Amino acid sequence: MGPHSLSYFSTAVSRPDRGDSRFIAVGYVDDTQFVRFDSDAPNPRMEPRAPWIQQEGQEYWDRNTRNVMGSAQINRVNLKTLRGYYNQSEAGSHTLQWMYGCYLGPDGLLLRGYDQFAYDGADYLALNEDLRSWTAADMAAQISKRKWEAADAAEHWRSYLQGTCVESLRRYLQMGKDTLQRAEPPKTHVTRHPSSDLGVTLRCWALGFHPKEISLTWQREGQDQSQDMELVETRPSGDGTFQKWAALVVPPGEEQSYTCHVQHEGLQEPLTLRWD
Amino acid sequence: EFEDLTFLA
Amino acid sequence: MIQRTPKIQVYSRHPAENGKSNFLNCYVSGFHPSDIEVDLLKNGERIEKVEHSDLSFSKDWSFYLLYYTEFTPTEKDEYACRVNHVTLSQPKIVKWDRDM
């Protein structure tokens, strides 16, 4: 079938300067956001954010709304709980983040699940790869670990990730087939600009590609120049495609000694590009 | 489909 | 507690051609905590109808957002992204460079 995932990325933030907290959740299939929930919205609901989810009937919207609202309430409580575990002041704002999801292998069969939490930007508690055990970051998280062991939380996560997560994923893939199941290769180009009297900058671009995953590497005589290379973060175009570039300063006159190697799942085979 | 159980920390 | 400063990239959706309708993007990533304010600027002035993506985050827990607006590039107009975040002592302005 192919490699694919369904994930939810949730952020709960305490706001003592507003006397409340906020929860936001977003859902993705692969790189494509499809739902959101925002507790600060008027009439907070699970809302569609891709066209191909819009046809879900009201019972889907109602159910997902009940469950995400439930989750918002629990994560708000968790913020208070964690403040207690770390003995933190009431005055400061704190963040609990949660990411969970399922992964299908290259054969379309379930390969991987995950369920993990961070507090104030650092790992707190994570379901291990075996889906049977938990890794706590510190003594606070060990309190939560003990609770979740006693509640057989891992067994409930296994059932969700094997059943509902994968089944939903596969229905989303069908509904969004014309965008989710076809990769678009990068449009590439290599620019050249003298950047001092000593050097010339070669920049290898990839634009217009999806999915986001891509490799751009400069080589000289079959050898990666990744130390000296400037490589920007992959960045979204805003229309479901992505952009990336990689740059290298090379000696004037030596431009043809260097090639940019592009790998992407939309390509028949990898590209070897030169300033041309 | 969103999870239908969130656990208390 | 962590605090990470935003990475900020300003660029167009499509390769920019003067007189051709396009979208101007300001991608802010790698930041923590999540509160952030982002304005898009034309010749120093705030652009009014600017939309943005829903808050999400990367595998390292750091946040990202895309801010964007329709525009038509010209020779004379200068565009920029202005960002404020707790890690910044004043609003950070990053100019749009067409070739970056």
Side-chain angles (χ1 to χ4, degrees):
Chain A
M1 298 138 56
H4 297 284
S5 62
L6 167 60
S7 289
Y8 292 92
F9 291 81
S10 300
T11 307
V13 177
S14 66
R15 301 187 297 198
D17 291 0
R18 287 165 68 121
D20 69 359
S21 58
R22 182 182 187 177
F23 185 83
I24 296 159
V26 295
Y28 287 82
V29 169
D30 299 339
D31 299 317
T32 302
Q33 187 184 351
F34 73 108
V35 289
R36 69 180 184 194
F37 176 83
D38 185 351
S39 66
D40 274 2
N43 185 203
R45 299 285 303 167
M46 191 77 88
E47 292 182 1
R49 297 292 282 157
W52 51 258
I53 200 76
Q54 290 272 187
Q55 293 177 261
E56 288 288 2
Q58 192 65 48
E59 287 172 320
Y60 174 98
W61 299 111
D62 290 347
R63 181 178 62 249
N64 274 270
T65 293
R66 283 189 268 98
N67 296 332
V68 75
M69 279 183 62
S71 215
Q73 301 173 163
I74 289 163
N75 283 298
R76 167 216 219 70
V77 172
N78 287 346
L79 282 162
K80 305 202 220 188
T81 300
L82 266 59
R83 192 187 101 211
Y85 292 168
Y86 292 110
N87 197 30
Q88 286 165 156
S89 142
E90 199 147 63
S93 170
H94 296 89
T95 308
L96 178 67
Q97 286 161 276
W98 178 30
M99 50 189 172
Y100 69 87
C102 54
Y103 272 79
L104 263 31
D107 63 357
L109 297 189
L110 175 65
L111 183 62
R112 257 251 208 189
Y114 89 93
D115 174 40
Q116 47 203 171
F117 291 86
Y119 185 62
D120 287 337
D123 293 334
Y124 180 75
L125 186 57
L127 187 62
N128 293 330
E129 186 69 42
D130 68 3
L131 316 180
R132 288 194 149 75
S133 62
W134 306 86
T135 295
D138 61 27
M139 294 198 98
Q142 287 184 266
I143 308 164
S144 294
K145 184 180 168 177
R146 289 192 293 272
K147 291 180 184 190
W148 292 3
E149 289 167 332
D152 209 350
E155 104 66 35
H156 289 105
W157 275 99
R158 287 199 298 286
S159 36
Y160 170 79
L161 297 161
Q162 181 177 202
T164 303
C165 193
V166 165
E167 290 165 16
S168 298
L169 176 51
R170 287 178 180 138
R171 288 177 330 84
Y172 299 149
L173 289 170
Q174 212 178 357
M175 291 158 63
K177 185 199 129 147
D178 290 331
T179 55
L180 297 172
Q181 298 202 46
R182 294 202 333 267
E184 243 262 85
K187 300 159 181 242
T188 63
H189 71 287
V190 172
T191 61
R192 191 204 84 125
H193 290 284
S195 43
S196 66
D197 290 334
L198 312 124
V200 173
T201 301
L202 271 2
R203 188 173 285 100
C204 186
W205 290 85
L207 298 179
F209 60 94
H210 70 254
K212 76 163 160 143
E213 282 69 29
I214 194 166
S215 181
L216 291 191
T217 62
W218 279 106
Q219 288 197 174
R220 180 184 159 101
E221 252 243 71
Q223 198 102 256
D224 276 2
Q225 312 293 115
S226 286
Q227 64 303 272
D228 296 335
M229 180 174 87
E230 173 160 44
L231 184 74
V232 286
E233 201 159 272
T234 304
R235 67 201 195 188
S237 292
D239 58 359
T241 66
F242 300 87
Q243 310 184 357
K244 202 193 189 60
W245 58 253
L248 182 64
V249 175
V250 310
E254 289 188 16
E255 296 92 338
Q256 302 307 128
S257 292
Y258 301 82
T259 44
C260 174
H261 287 255
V262 187
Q263 290 183 315
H264 189 262
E265 72 159 303
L267 294 167
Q268 59 311 312
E269 41 95 292
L271 302 174
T272 297
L273 305 170
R274 301 169 167 285
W275 176 51
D276 187 11
Chain B
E1 182 79 23
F2 207 83
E3 65 97 65
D4 67 342
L5 199 11
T6 296
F7 284 96
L8 286 165
Chain C
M1 180 59 77
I2 74 158
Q3 291 203 343
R4 299 184 74 188
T5 200
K7 297 138 188 270
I8 302 165
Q9 294 195 66
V10 180
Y11 55 100
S12 49
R13 173 179 297 186
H14 303 288
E17 302 172 32
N18 289 335
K20 295 307 196 191
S21 181
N22 208 327
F23 284 81
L24 174 69
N25 292 328
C26 180
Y27 184 57
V28 291
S29 65
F31 62 94
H32 222 286
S34 68
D35 274 6
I36 199 173
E37 282 105 313
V38 176
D39 289 342
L40 299 190
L41 308 189
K42 179 184 182 192
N43 302 318
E45 318 282 28
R46 165 161 155 264
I47 301 171
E48 287 259 50
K49 46 258 78 57
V50 171
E51 316 282 331
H52 62 271
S53 63
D54 301 319
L55 190 65
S56 192
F57 54 88
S58 303
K59 296 282 227 180
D60 71 357
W61 302 113
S62 67
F63 296 103
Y64 63 87
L65 293 161
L66 181 67
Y67 284 72
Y68 58 97
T69 194
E70 189 274 349
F71 78 138
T72 301
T74 63
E75 203 229 280
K76 70 174 182 202
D77 300 312
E78 301 290 16
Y79 288 93
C81 183
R82 180 177 70 205
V83 175
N84 222 135
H85 187 255
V86 68
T87 57
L88 301 171
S89 69
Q90 259 140 53
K92 205 190 301 245
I93 294 157
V94 178
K95 289 177 166 151
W96 181 44
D97 179 357
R98 325 214 141 206
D99 304 318
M100 289 292 285

